[PDB]
Amino acid sequence: MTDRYSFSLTTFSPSGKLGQIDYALTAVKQGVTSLGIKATNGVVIATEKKSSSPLAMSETLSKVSLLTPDIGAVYSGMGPDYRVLVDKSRKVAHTSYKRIYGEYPPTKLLVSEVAKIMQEATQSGGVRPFGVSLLIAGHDEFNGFSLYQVDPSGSYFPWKATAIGKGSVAAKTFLEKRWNDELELEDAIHIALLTLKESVEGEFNGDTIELAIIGDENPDLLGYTGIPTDKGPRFRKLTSQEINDRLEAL
């Protein structure tokens, strides 16, 4: 018995390719389109809620996830792989940072920790790489707003705006035309909804679209009052109603 697979399942081929990473990227390509846009006073991340069945309740399946009060994540590729990564990402934010410094990690460092986990699945014994690409949007005091992409290899890059998955090639081209360095948050949400309509085929409303922002602090969402320095989470998930309001003036 016991895990006898103590050797690497991802190896270099004669051409220098790492096959399993390339194949994991192919799995991400098949996945549903998700995107992220950075504004001057905020960041938006969005994706389509591909429902497996109309009997299924798509509210119970959350593609956009809170990692810390000021950091959120969305993906393209294999959903189960994403779910466990979010679990591990949330835990590592506490064990390797908050339990040491008494504060949440900045976006870039949390991203770095997630990347480390995904890199280890590329080299460790008896495991395949994660079949997902993540888009992590976040805010911290000294770096301000930021948006990062994380690939199956463990590589990560910062973006002004980008898209991943099914119709990423067309979506990136669309974002290049519309993006400028003076965009307000509301303008970035508007562009995100325009960009996402191109890749979505069926219904396009607040129930089939999942969208969250990293913006101003939300004291109403904190849950308590009395500490002036604690002003609430910058991560907010837009409601089904809030999306539909912006779809009328589209």
Do the beta carbons of residue 46 and residue 210 sit within 8 Å? yes
Contact between 29 and other proteins per CB under 8 A: yes
User: Contact region for other proteins (CB under 8 A) — 152-160, 197-205, 224-232, 237-245?
Assistant: 152-160
CA–CA gap between residue 205 and residue 199 (Å, rounded): 14
Contact between 168 and other proteins per CB under 8 A: no
Report the site for other proteins in 59-118 (rule: CB under 8 A): 59-61, 78-81, 83-84, 87, 108, 112, 115-116, 118
H or E element in which residue 68 lies: strand 65-68
* Closest to other proteins by CB, 54 or 226: 54
Contact between 170 and other proteins per CB under 8 A: no
Contact between 122 and other proteins per CB under 8 A: yes
Contact between 119 and other proteins per CB under 8 A: yes
Q: Using the rule CB under 8 A, which residue among 125, 205, 239, 242 binds other proteins?
A: 125
Size of the site for other proteins (CB under 8 A): 80
Closest distance of CB 30 from other proteins, Å: 6
Cβ neighbours of residue 50 closer than 8 Å, sequence gap 6 or more: 32
Contact between 195 and other proteins per CB under 8 A: no
